[PDB]
């Protein structure tokens with residue numbers, strides 16, 4: 001009938017009617033959460049006719065991977081998996097296949113720029129987990145390992161796969177560590193304005209609002225389909241970096257800081273027909289994420305206004321290019337602060353150059369590399385980065401990390 | 415069989431084989447010149463069965479435009495056009511329809527950010543033109559009018575429409591004014607490295623290589639299918655802006671300048687089935703085009719290296735964010751230089767804010783707005799601009815300005 005378009009800045013929604021008047025051969029590339037990048041809920045297990053081909057294809061991919069194929073084992077695995085499928089409905093991946101799966105799903109993540117690190121990933125097997133308290137412990141082990149007191153390590157914690165569709169393990173958080181956002185009495189908003197609706201959710205589940213700008217949100221976990229249990233993350237585990245500019249000593253007076261761990265929590269890993277709706281992963285930060293996005297977005301911390309004021313820029317004249325001046329410094333603050341406090345971080349320039357190297361390796365190796373230009377090009381210095389001048393193809397392969405419908409929208413409350 | 419991908423920086427070409435292994439519902443949005451945005455050559459006129467519906471649809475669009483429809487004239491025009499079509503094959507647009515066409519084709523240009531100015535466009539009717547010398551004169555009138563000694567004016571010069579497909583009026587230039595590029599003896603390259611192949615083309619047609627960094631290229635015009643005649647543009651017409659930073663007085667020592675007129679020359683206007691393969695248009699510049707793209711692209715002037723050196727930045731350490739510092743200043747140089755020499759220019763921030771206003775007007779007015787995010791988002795300060803957080807739909811409507819196959823690749827030489 002029509003297409004819904006949203007402006008993530010003002011949150012304003014629009015309805016596109018015009019596209020109907022279009023010619024022959026509409027691209028939706030600009031859309032944030034398209035259904036094509038989302039893998040939703042279920043009620044019944046994966047139909048056998050669908051699971052089997054996917055499984056067989058995955059197993060052929062895995063065995064067709066190493067240097068000198070173990071054909072007998074390949075044939076044996078195919079056979080054992082087929083049997084296991086017709087015997088239980090679903091099947092279990094060996095640890096080595098899961099390891100391969102996670103790396104490949106990352107390797108196939110069109111929106112990730114750090115993919116040159118794809119072969120360096122720690123896999124935490126939490127497939128035997130069965131309770132919320134148990135998830136929480138697995139998560140803590142993850143946060144601890146990943147953090148490594150600054151020298152961040154890429155890692156992923158794979159929880160139990162989806163069975164019938166009503167026994168899903170899900171983390172209700174955007175990411176492991178994430179500040180809270182509250183709409184204060186005086187009309188304002190303190191903290192991360194992006195976690196507003198979620199923060200309220202934690203409040204309704206009995207969370208203690210510490211009303212601040214950097215209040216690490218609680219872990220909201222759901223095990224085997226039972227309602228979510230609220231667990232607070234042990235502060236000793238949550239490593240942070242206090243922002244401070246190497247020149248403007250008044251920068252630390254802003255009282256800015258940010259967590260060192262970028263651990264996406266709400267994504268689903270699909271592989272060989274199977275699907276893990278809970279499998280938080282992490283790599284390390286890239287400056288612009290915090291410096292530009294987190295700190296400067298209108299819908300986020302929105303620090304630009306005063307960072308410019310304190311630099312003495314013509315804040316009421318757009319053409320003065322003050323925003324470009326401010327942000328650049330905020331970015332250096334971040335890179336410096338992290339680099340100083342010995343926390344692994346990467347600037348967008350070096351990141352872009354390493355990705356270009358990755359694309360080359362990828363095309364020569366498997367003849368391609370799924371890439372989402374819109375996401376790969378840094379939020380600043382677009383054409384200054386090599387990836388801006390690189391034409392790219394965006395496609396979904398398998399394994400793959402899909403998005404999923406926010407759990408609170410689709411959940412039964414016992 | 416496979417998809418060709420090019421890196422416009424290194425000019426390197428790659429072949430994507432992987433996309434075949436993709437799932438259900440591949441976006442090519444990242445591609446520069448897709449066939450979907452190109453309208454090629456022909457040998458025979460537009461088949462009547464195709465022309466008539468398009469014509470009728472266009473005429474219904476035009477008459478359905480004004481406030482209180484002139485139904486009788488609407489019906490009369492439909493009738494007269496139909497008759498004229500079955501009588502001559504093709505048909506002629508009234509001046510008022512052409513005016514409407516050009517504005518609408520601009521209005522439907524998914525890659526243009528200045529579209530809020532769509533209703534302010536001067537239309538030059540050169541449809542009666544028949545010789546190269548005549549084109550040249552029409553072009554000069556355009557350049558003169560558009561320039562207006564700094565106070566730039568949006569304008570378009572429409573030349574004779576395509577008839578049989580072998581009597582095309584074409585400008586072989588990328589744009590009206592455009593510097594030359596030569597590959598000097600010492601391995602280097604002087605001027606605009608983007609116009610290399612074209613500059614050589616002018617040289618072969620007897621052009622006098624003035625071997626410099628800012629040598630305005632000749633107008634290569636082809637009338638009614640006769641080979642291209644080379645005409646040099648009168649220097650009095652070519653207005654330029656010498657670059658100079660408001661603080662770094664050593665900036666003017668770079669000897670930088672750029673033309674004030676952004677007049678795209680090689681595009682085709684399609685409307686009501688008809689198509690004008692020659693219809694150069696112009697609006698005014700937006701800083702980042704010159705400051706970031708023209709001056710800093712690796713494939714262009716590539717000034718970044720020394721602009722950074724002269725600012726005393728750590729040119730051998732990427733993470734120092736020197737490139738972000740340099741470019742910002744180059745951008746202010748441009749904005750200042752233009753603003754100082756009273757030449758109309760627009761910074762990307764104000765441009766982005768006016769476009770957002772445009773989108774709103776557009777959606778409320780016709781229920782949509784074809785937008786290409788990849789092109790609309792400035793080459794710098796991505797997320798700092800409102801358009802970065804705006805989800806958008808990219809589609810081709812009619813009328814429309816299509817790209818066309820480079821004329822030298824498809825031309826008969828008598």
Ligand code: HEM
Pocket residue numbers: 102106109111112113114115117121154155156264267281282283284285286289346351401
């Ligand atoms: C090791 C260094 C890594 C770097 C520098 C890196 C960097 C990034 C960046 C800059 C983004 C965009 C984030 C945003 O704007 O929201 C991203 C997205 C993504 N990354 Fe990577 N990443 C790394 C590791 C990983 C790992 C280890 C995985 C998974 C195993 C991964 C999976 C993804 C996925 C799925 C996305 C999409 C996020 C979304 O759609 O919201 N990344 N990464």
Ligand code: HEM
Pocket residue numbers: 516520523525526527528529531535568569570678681695696697698699700703760765815
């Ligand atoms: C009046 C102010 C205008 C501004 C500020 C403006 C700005 C721009 C900018 C920034 C681009 C991207 C250029 C590039 O990166 O190559 C562009 C592209 C474009 N503009 Fe506008 N423009 C204006 C007027 C016009 C007019 C009057 C027309 C036509 C009647 C027009 C037609 C287009 C088209 C077709 C493109 C696509 C160019 C391509 O695909 O290479 N623009 N414009």
Ligand SMILES: C[C@H](O)[C@H](O)[C@H]1CNc2nc(N)[nH]c(=O)c2N1
Pocket residue numbers: 008029030031032374375376802803804805806
């Ligand atoms: C609407 C638009 O798609 C959206 O704002 C985008 C653009 N590109 C992005 N790229 C990255 N890396 N991260 C993002 O959140 C976004 N968001």
Ligand SMILES: C[C@H](O)[C@H](O)[C@H]1CNc2nc(N)[nH]c(=O)c2N1
Pocket residue numbers: 388389390391392422443444445446788789790
């Ligand atoms: C490969 C990629 O599509 C290309 O470099 C783009 C990106 N976006 C752009 N946007 C604008 N405005 N102008 C351009 O030339 C480009 N080129």
Ligand SMILES: N=C(NO)NCCC[C@H](N)C(=O)O
Pocket residue numbers: 262263264282283284285286289290293294
């Ligand atoms: N670098 C990564 N993953 O490895 N980032 C994940 C998303 C983090 C998000 N962009 C933030 O800044 O909060």
Ligand SMILES: N=C(NO)NCCC[C@H](N)C(=O)O
Pocket residue numbers: 676677678696697698699700703704707708
């Ligand atoms: N602003 C416009 N059109 O109005 N630009 C047209 C393309 C010019 C091109 N980007 C250049 O800098 O040479």
